[PDB]
């Protein structure tokens, strides 16, 4: 039975450190340093400027841990992973890469970057000025991205102004293409995306109409990092079913800031 596993990206650096995080780890001359171990050991080169990290932040160290833990679990489970698609957001491509590394499939499977499964533009505060890394930039940063993949939606076609209806439609169109982006291959396809995608990228498969915007927004608001929903195809009955994911959930606590000098 063919499967579609929608996976939320890991923890973002700005979720922990706030909107000013870039100021916290760069000099006036823009030299990177790590003021807390949860900042990553390096940033990829952004040829449009480090400032594009504000709109399009990387995973924190903990987010990398979560992604790798999920990949290791997927390996342990024995499922056959057959393809992976990712939102163009850095946090999503990085989540995909770290899952693949622990599956030991990062050389075997190329990441298919699909702007059609990007976040709802309304929720991207950056939207007007938002810039993803290009495929060539991703390749230069040692992401094994599919340079030959023709996306359902090119990035130039994402609309800052997209409505909820336009958002849910493009996800359905995107998922429709993705499900045909493989004749007969037995195994699971990873969809590495945003909280919104656990709803917007599964309901179309399940033949369900879109949720009312308010209901959708409420359901999607508190999906944790690496949160998963899994759909399996019943091809005889011509339908998809919502099914328990092939790996367990991940629950862990926080780690608070600590200043030794306070004693």
- Catalytic: 98? no
Distance CA 121, CA 119 (A): 6
Subset of 41-70 contacting its own copies (CB under 8 A): 41, 60-62, 65-66, 69-70
- Chain centroid to CA 165: how far? 21
In the residue annotation, 9 being an active-site residue is answered as yes
Structure tokens at 229: 């929903």
Segment interacting with its own copies, rule: CB under 8 A, options 115-123, 154-162, 182-190, 237-245: 237-245
What is the chain's length?
263
Is the distance from CB of 94 to CB of 64 less than 8 angstroms? yes
Contact 86, 92 (CB under 8 A): yes
Let me know: does 235 contact 219? Beta carbons within 8 Å: no
| DSSP-assigned letters across all residues of 240-251 | EEEE--SS----
DSSP annotation of 59 reads B
CB of 96 to its own copies, least distance (A): 18
Catalytic-residue membership of 252: no
**Cβ of residue 177: shortest distance to its own copies, in angstroms?**
23
Instruction: State which of positions 182-221 bind its own copies (CB under 8 A).
Output: 198-199, 219
Comparison of 60 and 95: residue with beta carbon closer to its own copies = 60
Binding test (CB under 8 A) with its own copies, winner from 4, 84, 100, 226: 226
Q: Which residues are CB-neighbours of 1 under 8 A, at least 6 positions away?
A: 186, 232, 233, 234
Q: Which is nearer to its own copies, 1 or 252 (CB)?
A: 252
With 0-12 CB in 10 A as exposed, 13-18 as middle and 19+ as buried, what is 256? exposed
Judged by CB under 8 A, the residue of 94, 174, 200, 225 near its own copies is 225
- The minimum distance between CB 210 and its own copies, in angstroms, equals 13
- Closest to 46 in 3D by CA, of 134, 111, 115: 134
Q: Applying CB under 8 A, which part among 98-106, 117-125, 169-177, 251-259 lies near its own copies? A: 251-259
Of these residues, 68, 112, 170, 194, which one is catalytic?
194
Binding segment toward its own copies, per CB under 8 A, in 90-98, 105-113, 179-187, 249-257: 249-257
Asked if residue 245 binds its own copies (CB under 8 A), the reply is: yes
Phi, psi of 233 (to 5 degrees): -85, 125
Please pick, from the candidates 43, 73, 96, 130, the single residue that binds its own copies as defined by CB under 8 A.
73
CB 51 within 8 Å of CB 82: no
Residues labelled catalytic: 8-9, 194
* Sites of contact with its own copies (CB under 8 A): 11, 15-17, 34-38, 41, 60-62, 65-66, 69-70, 72-73, 76, 198-199, 219, 222-230, 242, 244-245, 247-263
């Amino acid at each position: 039975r063919r499967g579609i596993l929608v996976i939320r990206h890991g923890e973002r650096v700005d979720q922990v450190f706030g909107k000013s995080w870039l100021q916290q780890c760069t000099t006036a001359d823009g030299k990177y340093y790590r003021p807390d171990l949860n900042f990553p050991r390096s940033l990829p080169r952004r040829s449009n400027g480090i400032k594009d990290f504000e709109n399009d932040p990387p995973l924190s160290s903990c987010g990398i841990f979560q992604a790798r833990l999920a990949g290791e679990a997927l390996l342990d489970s024995g499922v056959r992973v057959t393809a992976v698609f990712a939102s163009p957001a850095l946090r999503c491509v990085q989540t995909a890469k770290h899952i693949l590394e622990e599956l030991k499939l990062e050389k075997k499977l190329k990441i298919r970057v699909e702007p059609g499964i990007f976040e709802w533009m309304k929720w991207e505060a950056s939207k007007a000025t938002l810039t993803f890394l290009t495929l060539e930039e991703l390749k230069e940063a040692n992401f094994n991205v599919d340079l030959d993949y023709r996306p359902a939606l090119p990035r130039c076609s994402l609309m800052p102004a997209e409505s909820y209806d336009q958002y849910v439609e493009r996800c359905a169109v995107s998922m429709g293409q993705i499900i045909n982006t493989c004749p007969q291959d037995m195994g699971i396809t990873l969809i590495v995306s945003h909280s919104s995608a656990l709803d917007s990228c599964t309901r179309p498969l399940l033949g369900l109409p879109p949720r009312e915007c308010g209901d959708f927004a409420q359901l999607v608001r508190k999906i944790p990092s690496l949160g998963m929903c899994f759909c399996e195809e019943n091809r005889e009955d011509g339908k998809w079913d919502l099914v328990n994911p092939p790996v367990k959930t991940l629950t862990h606590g926080a780690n608070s800031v600590f200043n030794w000098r306070n004693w």
